[PDB]
Design a protein around this nucleic acid. Structure first.
Lengths: 176, 260, 62, 118, 139
RNA sequence: CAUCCGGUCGAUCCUGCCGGAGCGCGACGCUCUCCCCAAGGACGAAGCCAUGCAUGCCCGCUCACCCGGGACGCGGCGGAC
RNA sequence: GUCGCGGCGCGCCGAGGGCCCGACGCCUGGCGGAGAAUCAGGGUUCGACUCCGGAGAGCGGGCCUGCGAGACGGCCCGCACAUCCAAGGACGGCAGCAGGCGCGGAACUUGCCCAAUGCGCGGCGCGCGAGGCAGCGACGGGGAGCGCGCGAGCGAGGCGGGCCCACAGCCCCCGCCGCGCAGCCGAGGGCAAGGUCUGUGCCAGCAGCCGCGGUAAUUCCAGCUCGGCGAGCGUCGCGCGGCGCUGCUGCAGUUGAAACGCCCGUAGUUGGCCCCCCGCCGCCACGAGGAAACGGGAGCGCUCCAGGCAGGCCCGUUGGCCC
């Protein structure tokens, strides 16, 4: 049988219901320039994550307030969202969870965080920098632009001392 | 078909054993002896998982071949020897001895004991039967068979085994009020006093016992093991079967992970 | 069936025009962004226009 | 370029006379020059008194960072290493040489042929 | 209609079971008479050796001579007439060449002007027919 | 985690199917810069099989030209998993 | 008789037994569940395949051994189907693993090894095509690329050294070099993207459907641009969704398809109002009991992610709980 056969796998993205719709295409392209997104598949993965969360809150909210269930899981969902920075830490209500949008999830992507921190000039520049392993999420080198930073980790993010700046000074173009 | 099965698959193995899904495609096949598969846990699992004294099964066999560990005071070389409730797992070379009890979440737990506590182990008589010329015999949960029991002891009445002379020491009979620890099912791992026993003649005597949280748990006589009279008798785990709820355990988990 | 493929064998052959190789990946979508949204210099002539219009073209080269 | 090597959760194992632990080797902007280089550094905390007695295993180096974690098997005595050791681990260290290549297919072919020859 | 009573489930189950058969779609999918009729015999593709070649006049209004090869499937020795897609691609097909034929696309219905033809050639002599048209591979 | 849209007409409103729009999971074509996980002769042939291989271990009982090697057999246990 | 119970078999005696709440027959390109696909709610279809139970080793049978086999990597017989042969005889059984042929639309190496995970046997480890390790492999799932900037960089590679490994290798870590690289389907609609410029002339073709082409083809065949999706994209067969076109929610029956020509009528289904306070039935709630995986779902930064149960001086660190 083998251990591998036992391993789970998942489709983390939702493809559209109509794939040639004019409104969806326009917003997608506007989002694509905004966050330096590689393919619509990355945008799709964002919609999926929001839909899971929205449904989880929806079910807990249909359950009556103070029903054991909302206490155990609703507190957990809010905690998780506040700790990834998707949700404002003041809101802290399950009803607010429903009113989230994919853009806000995309905002916590490191490439957007690097740009607001300014460690790079553009969202394009942020993607190239994170790829070159220049970025550090805090004592840890990050090569993946997708990385979603936790709200606490944002301050820890800095260009790693070993990199293009403050270093050997001789990699790539400098060597020749 | 044909004869017996000498292999156990990892996902078939009991959940309380907490074996890794990707850890292996096979699990230790527990052997027969004093405890059955549903109500046992292999000796290799205590030494490899909780104790971590032996890195691999091979190391556990080497230690066992040299009689490093003694259960019930006897050095046993069975990696798959079944271990269950009140079994005294004493490893003298490491200098540490503990009993094997039940955690609130139902996994078997190693609870440290003093030298007096190490000497004796509790037992539960399943029933008293007549055989071999009519002599009565009492069969403990640990399958220990004792000829000629004192007449007062009845079915389901906890008794204490010397384990040095291996004889009955005393009997705490099962009755209303006496403190018991559930051994199986949803309430497994919970110590409570007996509020009432429902006769339910025909099948399944169902007993209700309540802990000091005012919460009554209803469990049939099969998995009710008396642990002293009103006194808890033998030392009990630190949680003491007080039934922590899911929300409360959520806070405890978060405090533990607060530490880095 | 003696007339099979009558247009294909007698159609004239026009060579593929050599072109600046287009950017690929996120870089293509990034260059598609200037056209679609912020910028708009290439896609407008006093009003919105289609990407393959004969008026957008000739004004943007081809 | 400094290297800091620490032992965490060491285990007393009189049965196999070993000292199981987890080794955190910190080599920021550096490469530890092999496990033996940090074996002496691990020996300092372990206090075994013989670097050879210490066995080092599973030294995963984290992606990019200088936090590498490796299980440690500093046997308390030499007899333990002599006995309770994966023959291959003993071979990796260089404590013993390896046996000359054997087909194993021949070891099974020999079994098949030796049974047929009654 | 809609008999509804707390204890009337059996009547409703029977009605659904009997009535569901009425749709052509349930019958073609589940009666399975079609499986025996299907030349493809429950396969996406079938391998058959070309036994004949012909030109089928396109159904009016559209007029052309669609190019097709009559092929007997190797699997069941069952006749199939298969359209050759692309422009002048019957030149690629040769009699006795051996072809892989796939459904025309309407699940057993003739597609477009071609009359009563339910199959199309996707491969000739181990080489994809589209690739032959696109000049990816030769003969 | 609630949607439709083309085709009966001179036009129109219906019913009604036809065809599209989504996801699978197999085939087929074309193509493929790296890394991770991962299915793989089930699909009306439970058709036929060349070769090699998948079940041994023990040392009870040693008068087999090293030794107390532990041949070989006898025994034992497994081969029913 | 059996391990035993039983028409299980045999005598003996009766006439039962089953059935529109579908017996019996027949067919099944029928292993069943845990589950899976799709999915507002309800639903539909599949369940060979990972776990559990069943069944079989070409086909029927029959046995022996053992505690347990009607065992086939045991035996014996017929039956097809092989091999050898000095011609008397001998002898198999890959629905075990690799590998071969046939067949089909369709499917991988005659590898390497017990180091783990188990098991058999031993007390100082041996056996294992169970299993692990490599190769093959766009079944698929997941993550980063083909630049950014206007000067600095990376990693794809290449080479050493670690790390890893039964031994390699891969990963990862380092020095030293360092050379980014896109397809596949379309642009009349539905359906996002020229009413371009060629050829051609109801031909050749295209087109799921509407249709297009017969000299000014928005549709073919090509350059041209553009659009979708993306290391993938297109086609075919099917499942599900769409389809309230199967309808319990939730269809329709004057005329679109559809009230039996009528009345009686049993089975079936459905029955007004009434008693409070009990007994059975459903009924609702909450238990207990018994498999995990799976699916949820607590916690945990596998660098992110698909993952996995981790981790870290830790609730007796965890691995809860629901189903």
């Amino acid at each position: 049988p083998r251990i591998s056969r036992h391993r789970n796998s998942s489709k983390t993205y939702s493809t559209p219901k109509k794939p040639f719709t004019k409104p969806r295409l326009d917003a997608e392209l506007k989002l694509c320039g905004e966050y330096g997104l590689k393919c619509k598949r990355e945008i799709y993965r964002a919609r999926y994550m929001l839909a899971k969360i929205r449904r989880t809150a929806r079910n807990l909210l249909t359950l009556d307030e103070n029903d054991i269930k909302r206490r155990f899981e609703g507190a957990a969902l809010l905690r998780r969202l506040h700790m990834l920075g998707i949700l404002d830490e003041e809101k802290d209500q399950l009803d607010y969870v429903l009113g989230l949008r994919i853009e806000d999830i995309f905002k916590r992507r490191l490439q957007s965080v690097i740009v607001e921190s300014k460690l790079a000039k553009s969202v394009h520049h942020a993607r190239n920098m994170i790829k070159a392993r220049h970025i550090s999420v805090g004592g840890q080198i990050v090569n993946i632009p997708s990385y979603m930073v936790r709200i606490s980790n944002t301050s820890r993010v800095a260009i790693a001392d070993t990199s293009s700046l403050a270093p050997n000074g001789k990699p790539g173009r400098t060597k020749r | 078909a044909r004869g017996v099965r000498k292999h156990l698959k990892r996902l078939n193995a009991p959940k309380h054993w907490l074996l890794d899904k990707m850890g292996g495609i096979w699990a230790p096949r527990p052997t027969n002896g004093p405890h059955g598969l549903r109500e046992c846990i292999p000796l290799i699992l205590i030494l490899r998982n909780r104790l971590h004294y032996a890195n691999t099964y091979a190391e556990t066999s080497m230690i066992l071949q040299d009689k490093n560990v003694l259960i019930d005071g006897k050095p046993r070389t069975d990696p798959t020897f079944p271990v269950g409730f009140m079994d005294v797992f004493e490893i003298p070379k490491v200098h540490k001895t503990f009993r094997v009890l039940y955690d609130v979440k139902g996994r078997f737990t190693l609870v440290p004991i003093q030298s007096n506590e190490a000497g004796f182990k509790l037992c539960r008589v399943q029933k008293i039967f007549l055989g071999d010329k009519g002599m009565p015999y009492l069969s403990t949960h640990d399958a220990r068979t004792i000829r000629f029991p004192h007449p007062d002891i009845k079915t389901n009445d906890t008794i204490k085994i010397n384990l040095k002379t291996g004889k009955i020491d005393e009997w705490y009979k099962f009755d209303i009020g006496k403190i018991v620890m559930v051994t199986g099912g949803r309430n497994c791992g919970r110590i409570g006093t007996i509020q009432a026993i429902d006769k339910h003649m025909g099948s399944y005597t169902m007993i209700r016992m309540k802990d000091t949280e005012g919460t009554e748990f209803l469990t049939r006589l099969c998995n009710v093991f008396v642990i002293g009279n009103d006194s808890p008798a033998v030392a009990i785990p630190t949680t003491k079967g007080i039934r922590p709820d899911i929300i409360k355990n959520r806070e405890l988990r978060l405090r533990s992970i607060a530490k880095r | 069936l003696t007339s099979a493929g009558k247009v294909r064998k007698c159609t004239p052959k026009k060579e593929k025009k050599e072109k600046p190789r287009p950017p690929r990946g996120r870089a293509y979508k990034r260059l598609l962004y200037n056209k679609n949204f912020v910028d708009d210099t290439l896609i407008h002539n006093g009003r919105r226009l289609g990407p393959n219009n004969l008026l957008i073209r000739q004004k943007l080269g081809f | 370029p400094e290297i800091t090597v620490k032992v965490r959760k060491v285990l007393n194992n009189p049965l196999l006379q070993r000292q199981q632990c987890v080794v955190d080797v910190l080599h920021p902007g550096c490469t530890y020059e092999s496990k033996e280089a940090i074996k002496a550094k691990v020996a300092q905390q372990l206090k075994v008194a013989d670097q050879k007695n210490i066995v080092l295993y599973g030294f995963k180096t984290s992606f990019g960072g200088g936090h590498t974690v490796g299980f440690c098997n500093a046997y308390q005595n030499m007899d333990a290493l002599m006995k309770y050791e994966p023959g291959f681990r003993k071979i990796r260290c260089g404590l013993i040489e390896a046996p000359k290549p054997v087909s194993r297919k021949q070891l099974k072919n020999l079994k098949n042929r030796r049974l047929k020859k009654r | 209609s809609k008999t509804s009573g707390l204890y009337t489930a059996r009547k409703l189950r029977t009605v659904r079971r009997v009535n569901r058969w009425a749709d052509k779609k349930y019958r073609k999918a589940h009666l399975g008479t079609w499986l025996k009729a299907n030349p493809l015999e429950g396969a996406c593709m079938a391998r058959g050796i070309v036994t004949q070649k012909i030109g089928i006049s396109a159904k009016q209004p559209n007029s052309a001579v669609r190019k097709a090869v009559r092929v007997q499937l190797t699997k069941n020795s069952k006749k199939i007439t298969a359209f050759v897609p692309r422009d002048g691609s019957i030149t690629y097909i040769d009699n006795n060449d051996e072809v892989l034929v796939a459904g025309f696309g309407r699940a057993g219905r003739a597609v477009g002007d071609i009359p009563g033809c339910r199959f199309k050639v996707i491969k000739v002599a181990g080489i994809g027919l589209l690739a032959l048209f696109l000049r990816k591979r030769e003969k």
